[PDB]
Amino acid sequence: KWASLWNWFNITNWLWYIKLFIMIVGGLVGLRIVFAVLS
Amino acid sequence: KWASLWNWFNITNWLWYIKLFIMIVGGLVGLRIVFAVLS
Amino acid sequence: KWASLWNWFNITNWLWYIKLFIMIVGGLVGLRIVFAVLS
Numbered sequence: 001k002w003a004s005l006w007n008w009f010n011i012t013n014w015l016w017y018i019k020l021f022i023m024i025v026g027g028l029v030g031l032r033i034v035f036a037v038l039s
Numbered sequence: 040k041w042a043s044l045w046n047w048f049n050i051t052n053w054l055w056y057i058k059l060f061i062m063i064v065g066g067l068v069g070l071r072i073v074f075a076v077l078s
Numbered sequence: 079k080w081a082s083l084w085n086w087f088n089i090t091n092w093l094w095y096i097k098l099f100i101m102i103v104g105g106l107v108g109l110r111i112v113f114a115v116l117s
Contacts, residue, residue: 022103025061028068029106036113039075064107072108 002009014021051058092099 016101021061025065025068025103026106028072029103029110031069032068032113035075036117066102067107069080071114078091 011019013019052058089097091097
C-alpha cells in the first residue's frame with residue numbers, strides 16, 4: 001500500500017491547477033530549443 | 040445552427056479534462072524525441 | 079500604484095479561458111513543426 005504517498009503523488013502530478021501535467025509539457029518543449037543548439 | 044455545431048465541436052474536442060486539447064499537443068512533442076533518436 | 083496594468087496583465091496571462099497560459103505551451107510546439115520543415 002501507499003495511500004498517503006499516493007495523495008501527495010496526486011498533488012505532484014496535477015490534483016489542483018497546472019503542476020507536472022503542464023510542466024512536463026513546458027520543459028520538454030523548452031528542452032528541444034538547446035538540444036537543436038548542441039545537436 | 041450555431042449552438043448545435045459549437046456543442047458538436049466541444050464534445051469531440053474538450054468538453055471535460057485533458058482530451059485532444061492536451062493530447063494532440065503533448066503527443067507531437069513526444070514524437071520529436073524519438074525522431075532525434077532514430078535520426 | 080500598479081493596479082490597472084496588473085489586473086490587465088493577469089487577464090492577459092490567464093484568469094478565465096486559454097490565454098498565454100495555453101498560448102506559451104501551444105505556440106512553442108507549433109514552433110517545432112516549422113523548425114523541422116526548415117531543418
